[PDB]
Amino acid sequence: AQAFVDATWPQAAKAAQSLGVPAHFLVAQAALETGWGKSQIRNKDGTPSYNLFNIKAGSNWTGKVVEARTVKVRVERFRAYDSYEQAFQDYADLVGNSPRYAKVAGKTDGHAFARALQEGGYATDPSYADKLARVINGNALRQRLMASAASARGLE
């Protein structure tokens, strides 16, 4: 999971700064969605979709599309990108501009942030906010963020 955090951090930071929320909120969200990178949607040719946020490809999406099965079994159409950078940019556009997500900006509490996404219709699971807040506030993420940093301070 460390490489996932290391890779997503700069992209998350860029997007978080445009969305007005802490960068680790977005790292946490991507981690929850993809099992810290382990369960990302993949193209048939083996290239990843880079779609860390599991964003569906609807009628207003004319980009690359990847089909993936969801839970009996439905085939769902997902957005696909050329990089994590592009995926984060598309996420930033959606959450930053869509009025349904207007409550996201300026949230500095994990649970408040997750509730704002849920209100926008990001996901409907009633436990979504609790589950995402747990990752945001958790020791697992904290340790990985510290490990990712170029600098650290001595105890004295």
Automatic annotation (TrEMBL):
Instruction: Give the similarity note.
Output: In the C-terminal section; belongs to the glycosyl hydrolase 73 family. In the N-terminal section; belongs to the FlgJ family.
Q: Which organism is it from?
A: Sphingomonas sp. A1
Upper classification of the source organism reads: Bacteria, Pseudomonadati, Pseudomonadota, Alphaproteobacteria, Sphingomonadales
Q: What does this protein do?
A: Flagellum-specific muramidase which hydrolyzes the peptidoglycan layer to assemble the rod structure in the periplasmic space.
Residues included from the entire protein: 153 to 313 of 313
Q: Which gene encodes it?
A: flgJ
- Residue span(s) of domain Mannosyl-glycoprotein endo-beta-N-acetylglucosamidase-like: 1-145
List locations, semicolon-separated: Periplasm
Put simply, this protein is called Peptidoglycan hydrolase FlgJ
